[PDB]
């Protein structure tokens, strides 16, 4: 069901000349160089957002309600008020301990916290990233400790080794008497994405009360919320039921800057590829104006046969789209074989240069993911065709004003 | 009329069409290189402004390189300040380093010892919040803690802490005991950076480490972007070069890897524009095949007729790189000067810019190189062909 505006101009592109066979090769390569890299460019941006909800957002609590330098003697009634908040899923207490480890003539910054091992699987995905066989051995009364992956590289210890950490004394008077060192044995290590490997440790809540020589008193209250895009309003109203004012915080001020840097690339890479396809559509203009002056005899034939102005103008519109559609669809075939198989590609370059990039020290992760979305394929297809239609519209207006009586008809 | 026989037959091949649209088609190769340079120098200018402000708050507040000995400490009487005349050094000051650990009545912390001389000028002196530099007296053991360091430790002014050195420990035959003394605090300074959480100002004369001497000398550099380039120069004997790459060797190295990825993605604009020269000159030879055989009959060697089409592919690269660098430097300097023209960003951090004059010259020579190597193949097809066997 071919229409009249497109016509039968598929056979017009099968021209024969000199070096014109090489011009058609570069015209579909340079216009696909900005399309095939934009599909794999936005694939890694979706992979960074997918790994954030499983390795970053699922391992830290959202809302943190601490105490302003005071031991909470009535923290049992505060857990019932935060649980009935319309928008808070669960709640669990935690005690912050600012201690270090001194084993093997080294110095590492570790942040150990006291969480209940029976209630840690209801607010965060913390024990789902342990390299050990199980984690149910975290009972009360045997001095357990579990460290990260970035601590064992400096201490050179494995599962079953006794280590000595620095535990501060909770003296009521401001004085120093002696440092406290308690021998603890590790029962396996855990791995995380790229940040909380050398500064993460956990102790049970029943084993943390004997270090402060207290009874039943915690310091902070952790929680988990359903919606994560609004983490500033759910923390303010949840702290107005315990006392007058406490120190409130969230994951926006310490981990929420990654969403600003991910969305900034989408506002830059998509803006940069406008100028890439914009200078790639100049190849269509250089082959459309060149296709007018040599084939100007066939334009004067159709004017003598009784063609209107809209018919002789729409010929070169669909003629310039044939060189663009073959190059735009050539980037979709490359865009699905590189994005779906990116993990054998990035690892292949790192083992031939000598040094690998994207280290797991201050970055997000160590590997490079790619989550191909079919909605972004339709967005890049219409964007490459909208610039090709704007580039072929202006030579189509020039070809509609050719005098048929000037050329020898 | 020109005295050069090669540039005379090309001044009329760019403006042969006196039309409103026919002149814009032949000048399409100029806009492709102009828009490719101004989208490269302007974007890399705000990336250099991020690296400029990162060194003024981290590397501008810590010692970059220390000239320490390989046998432990360094005697100041053997290596004075007159025999340390190296390249890039403008000021030599005595300093000591070392991994230390805090010990307070509430919690412990991490940090490195930074012993300075109070009789010399220090850049941390405007950042001292009501703390005089003359209070750091030898024998008093006064420690000036940081803003973020004392905030999480709970140590206010007029308190007493304990500093232990696990690295420089006395190897006693009976066991392993670290050296530690009693230390009192005098104040808290703030600088609005990240180095305040692990750096304190103590006296230079201390007995917590080994041996009264120092460990090394603090040296300042004019450009700290090339520490690895001057790491293979002539050093005096009995010394070891220790730079900031042992601790901060992955932070400032991470910024240089991001410039090789953004700068290579923006280099695809001139790569496709270099492919436009092959198509603009590849179709120009086949529509002007009769003009090639005329010059061969009037007398012209095929070596010189290859250079004729080389000027058409190099005229867009010369004037495209100068105009692209002029508009690229004007957009970066006048970005947030008069009015925001790129959009109201929700940051509010007063985004700066840094235009390096050496970076403009190396970028413009790249666009004049890939535009010249892509011209050799359309220029060779117009000379290797036969003048009379082609069409006439």
């Amino acid at each position: 069901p071919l229409s009249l505006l497109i016509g039968l101009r598929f056979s017009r592109g099968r021209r024969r000349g000199g070096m014109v066979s090489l011009i058609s090769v570069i015209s579909t390569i340079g216009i696909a160089l900005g399309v095939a890299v934009l599909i794999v460019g936005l694939s890694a941006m979706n992979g960074f957002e997918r790994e954030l909800n499983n390795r970053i957002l699922a391992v830290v609590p959202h809302g943190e309600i601490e105490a302003v330098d005071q031991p909470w003697t009535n923290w049992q009634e505060a857990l019932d008020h935060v649980q009935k908040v319309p928008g808070i899923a669960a709640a669990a207490p935690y005690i912050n301990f600012t201690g270090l480890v001194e084993s093997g003539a080294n110095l590492r910054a570790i942040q150990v916290k006291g969480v209940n091992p029976q209630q840690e699987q209801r607010l965060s995905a913390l024990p789902s990233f342990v390299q050990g066989d199980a984690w149910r051995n975290f009972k009360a009364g045997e001095q357990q400790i579990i460290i990260g992956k970035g601590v064992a590289d400096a201490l050179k210890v494995k599962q079953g080794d006794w280590v000595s950490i620095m535990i501060p004394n909770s003296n009521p008077e401001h004085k120093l008497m002696q440092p406290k060192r308690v021998r603890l044995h590790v029962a396996g290590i855990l791995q995380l994405s790229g940040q909380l490997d050398h500064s993460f440790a956990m102790i049970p809540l029943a084993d943390a009360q004997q270090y402060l020589d207290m009874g039943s008193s915690v310091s902070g209250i952790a929680l988990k919320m359903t919606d994560v895009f609004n983490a500033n309003k759910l923390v303010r109203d949840a702290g107005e039921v315990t006392n007058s004012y406490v120190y409130i915080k969230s994951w926006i001020g310490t981990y929420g800057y990654m969403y600003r840097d991910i969305q900034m690339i989408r506002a830059i890479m998509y803006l940069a590829m406008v100028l890439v396809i914009g200078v790639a559509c100049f190849n269509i203009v250089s082959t459309l104006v060149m296709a007018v002056k040599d084939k100007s005899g066939d334009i004067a034939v159709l004017r003598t046969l009784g063609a209107k102005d809209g018919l002789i103008r729409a010929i070169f519109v669909w003629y310039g789209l044939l060189a663009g559609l073959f190059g735009s669809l050539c980037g979709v075939i490359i865009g699905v074989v590189v994005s779906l198989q990116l993990t054998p590609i990035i690892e292949w370059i790192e083992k031939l240069i000598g040094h690998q990039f994207l280290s797991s020290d201050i970055y997000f992760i160590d590997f490079l993911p790619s989550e191909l979305h079919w909605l972004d394929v339709f967005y890049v297809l219409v964007t490459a065709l909208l610039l090709s239609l704007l580039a072929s519209w202006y030579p189509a207006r020039r070809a509609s004003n050719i005098d048929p009586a000037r050329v020898l008809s | 009329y020109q005295p050069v026989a090669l540039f005379i037959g090309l001044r009329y091949m760019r403006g042969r069409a006196a039309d409103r649209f026919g002149r814009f088609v032949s000048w399409l190769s100029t806009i492709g290189i102009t828009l490719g340079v101004m989208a490269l120098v302007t974007v890399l200018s705000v990336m250099n402004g991020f690296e400029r402000e990162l060194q003024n708050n981290i590397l501008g507040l810590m010692p970059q390189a220390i000239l320490s000995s390989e046998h432990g400490s360094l005697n100041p009487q053997q290596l004075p300040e007159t025999a340390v005349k190296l390249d890039g050094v403008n000021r030599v000051a005595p300093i000591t380093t070392g991994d230390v650990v805090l010990q307070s009545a509430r919690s412990v912390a991490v940090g490195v010892m930074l012993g300075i001389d109070p009789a010399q000028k220090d850049p941390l002196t405007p950042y001292l919040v009501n703390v005089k530099q003359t209070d750091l007296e030898p024998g008093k053991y006064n420690v000036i803690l940081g803003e973020q360091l004392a905030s999480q430790l709970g140590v206010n002014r007029g308190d007493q802490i304990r500093v232990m050195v696990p690295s420089a420990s006395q190897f006693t035959p009976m066991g392993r005991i670290p050296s530690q003394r009693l230390f009192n605090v005098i104040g808290t300074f703030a600088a609005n950076s990240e180095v305040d959480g692990y750096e304190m100002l103590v006296n230079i004369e201390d007995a917590s480490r080994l041996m009264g001497n120092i460990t090394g000398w603090r040296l300042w550099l004019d450009e700290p972007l090339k520490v690895d380039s001057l790491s293979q120069q002539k050093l005096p004997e009995g010394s070891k070069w220790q730079d900031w790459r042992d601790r901060k060797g992955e932070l400032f190295q991470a910024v240089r890897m991001e410039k090789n990825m953004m700068g290579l993605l923006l280099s695809l604009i001139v790569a496709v524009a270099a492919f436009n020269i092959i198509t603009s000159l590849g179709l120009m030879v086949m529509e002007k095949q009769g003009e090639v055989a005329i010059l061969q009959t009037q007398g012209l060697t095929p070596r010189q007729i290859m250079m004729v089409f080389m000027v058409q592919g190099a005229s867009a690269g010369i004037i495209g790189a100068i105009l692209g660098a002029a508009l690229g430097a004007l957009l970066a300097s006048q970005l947030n000067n008069l009015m925001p023209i790129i959009g109201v960003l929700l940051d509010g951090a007063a985004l700066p810019v840094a235009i390096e004059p050496l970076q403009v010259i190396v970028i413009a020579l790249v666009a004049m190189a890939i535009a010249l190597l892509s011209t050799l193949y359309p220029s060779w097809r117009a000379a290797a062909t036969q003048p009379a066997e082609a069409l006439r």
Binding site: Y247, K249, G253, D261 | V255, E258
Partner: peptide, 10 residues
């Protein structure tokens, strides 16, 4: 990335 500020809110 490389654009960090480390600003907290009490």
């Amino acid at each position: 990335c490389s654009s960090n500020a480390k600003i907290d809110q009490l």
